[PDB]
């Protein structure tokens, strides 16, 4: 039932173009052509901007746009806990589950998606931290493991939104994890006139706005 | 359960002392039977039970100490309903020093060790918070001093995945899974480490 | 049961009967024209000025106002704990009883208001603590996402009272999580009368008061 419109977003039809271009040309080709060429498929997003814009909602829309397991989310800094090394069974705990469907099917497999927000609070420079806290050095050195480790897992996409993008640290932000990062704006006349479009459809429905309007 | 009264007595030998358990004799109850022995009104004390007089019931002098018991004292000595699927500890924070200060040393201890010891040697006993007892480790004696328990979730015991939701329990009983964490007091050489002996971060201020 | 002179408050009309149309209109009036609307309820106060203007007797008496739950109150930092994750959790368990009704009686359930005193104790603009800020950090971002979510709360209300708003964070004060900025302020000759009379109804009612006054 997919269709543009359904998805509600106002004036980002620059950005959304570029999104599934750079993220989802490869899955939409018959499985033939591009064995043929050989490419691998993006694994990480991440958007960023000023407060505000919509950022978790076109996370919500993709993810409703995809077909596919329903996405595991992390609502921020859930994954700390007091017991030495804990947190690193929950984030293993995450990955579990793709590493067993991946064995099972092979290259034919699904697709899983997983949602990361308020990844700042987790993922932040192993070296510029509080000395006395190593357990977020732990957590980044054992995600970039997880993620990217000598061993490939290729049904993955994760999602990561902040509002200081200087604080994300040099080493996740590399070719493999999260090359693509996308810059979110104020919108145009039009794109304000499409969401008063949007927030006014039901007050013309049910003609309860004026005309003078 | 009706409570019998009983008379205090010492406890026959130290090896008794060391299992926790206050010492009966057979004609009174059974080896594991659990009791509520009530010092007064307000003080209720939960216990895990040949040469024991029958009518008396032999405390170790640290149970006497934390309880209050002295030798010879009339008792009343019930039983406790010990919920099943809930107390059952999930982990447990115990406070930890070497037994006397003449033997202490500042090298690091492997300590996971001395957990799964502790597990095997004290399994399915009762504990409670407040509750002080010995250890020994590379022939070295420990202090220890519970503070704080947590159960398992119930839905472990149901064989389900844990909610996070850990009571907080006024007593709890040790089984084959059960964790313990043991935290130094202050002042203190005493390295440890293990990595299962636990040492929450210590979330403290420092001054530049 | 409920009456404006009761709550013994002068001076702040016209603030009040602001605050009532930006806060209460949607849940008095008649729901079914609300249906058609399709809008959501505002979930977000603070109140703001120098010391002793009475801003906590504004808080109390609305609690008293409303005919609801008995509200949860937060007296200053009661949330710090020594140890890591607890903080979070107890954040947490602030909202978990809302969270149990939504998911059970869906639309047709009850309101929740929760205060916070000092909330400038808690909530400081991030990446200012030299030391240990890998708590403060942690604390602003669970507030926030707890607040704002991908899953969605319609059965929740904030009041917050505070004495320096210049220093709060601007993620906390965006559209959506706390619209409706009050200022109390000193007030005028009017007001001043007002407000002896509501303090002094009692002796006059007692014949306590000299008649040369
Ligand atoms: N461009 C937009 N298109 C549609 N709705 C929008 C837009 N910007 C804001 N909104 C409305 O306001 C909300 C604000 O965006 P959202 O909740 O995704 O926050 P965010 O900017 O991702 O997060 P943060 O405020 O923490 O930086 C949207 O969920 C939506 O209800
Ligand atoms: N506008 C007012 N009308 C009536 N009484 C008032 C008013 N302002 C203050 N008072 C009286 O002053 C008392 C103290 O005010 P209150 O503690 O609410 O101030 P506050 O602004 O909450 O405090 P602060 O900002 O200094 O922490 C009130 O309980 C009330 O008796």
Redesign the interface.
Same mark, same amino acid.
Not at chain 2, 198 to 208: A, Y
């Given at each position: 039932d997919w269709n543009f419109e359904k998805m509600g977003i106002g004036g980002l039809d620059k950005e959304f173009s570029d999104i599934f271009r750079r993220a989802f040309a490869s899955r939409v080709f018959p499985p033939e052509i591009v064995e043929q060429m050989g490419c691998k498929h993006v694994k990480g997003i991440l958007l960023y901007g000023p407060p505000g814009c919509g950022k978790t909602l076109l996370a919500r829309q993709i993810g409703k746009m995809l077909n596919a397991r329903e996405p595991k989310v992390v609502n921020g800094p859930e994954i700390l806990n007091k017991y030495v090394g804990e947190s690193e069974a929950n984030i293993r705990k995450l990955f579990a589950d793709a590493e067993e469907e991946q064995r099972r099917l092979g290259a034919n497999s699904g697709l899983h998606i997983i949602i990361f927000d308020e990844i700042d609070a987790i993922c932040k420079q192993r070296g510029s931290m509080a000395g006395s806290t190593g357990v977020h050095d732990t957590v980044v050195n054992q995600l970039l493991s997880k993620i990217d480790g000598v061993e490939q897992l290729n049904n993955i996409l994760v999602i990561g939104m902040t509002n200081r993008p200087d604080l994300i640290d040099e080493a996740l932000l590399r070719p493999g994890r999260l090359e693509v990062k996308m810059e979110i704006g104020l919108p145009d006349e039009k794109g304000r006139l499409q969401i008063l479009h949007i927030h006014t459809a039901r007050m013309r429905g049910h003609q309860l706005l004026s005309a003078d309007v | 359960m009706a409570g019998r009264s009983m008379q205090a007595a010492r406890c026959p030998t130290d090896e008794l002392s060391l299992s926790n358990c206050a010492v009966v004799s057979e004609k009174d109850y059974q080896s594991g039977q659990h009791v509520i022995v009530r010092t007064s009104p307000n003080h209720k004390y939960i216990f895990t039970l040949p040469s024991v007089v029958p009518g008396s019931v032999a405390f170790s002098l640290p149970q006497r100490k934390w309880a209050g018991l002295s030798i010879g004292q009339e008792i009343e000595v019930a039983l406790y309903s010990f919920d099943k699927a809930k107390q059952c500890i999930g982990?447990m924070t115990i406070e930890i020093d070497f037994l006397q200060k003449k033997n202490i040393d500042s090298n690091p201890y492997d300590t996971d060790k001395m957990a799964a010891e502790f597990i095997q040697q004290f399994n399915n006993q009762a504990f409670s918070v407040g509750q002080q007892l010995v250890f020994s480790f590379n022939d070295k004696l420990f202090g220890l001093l519970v503070k704080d328990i947590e159960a398992m979730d119930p839905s472990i015991l149901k064989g389900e995945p844990a909610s996070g939701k850990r009571q907080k329990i006024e007593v709890g009983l040790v089984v084959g899974n059960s964790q313990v =964490?043991f935290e130094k007091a202050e002042n203190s050489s005493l390295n440890l480490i293990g +990595? =299962?002996k636990? +040492?929450?971060?210590?979330?403290? !201020? !420092?001054?530049?």
């Open positions: - | 982990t =964490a +990595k =299962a636990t +040492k929450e971060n210590r979330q403290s !201020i !420092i001054n530049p």
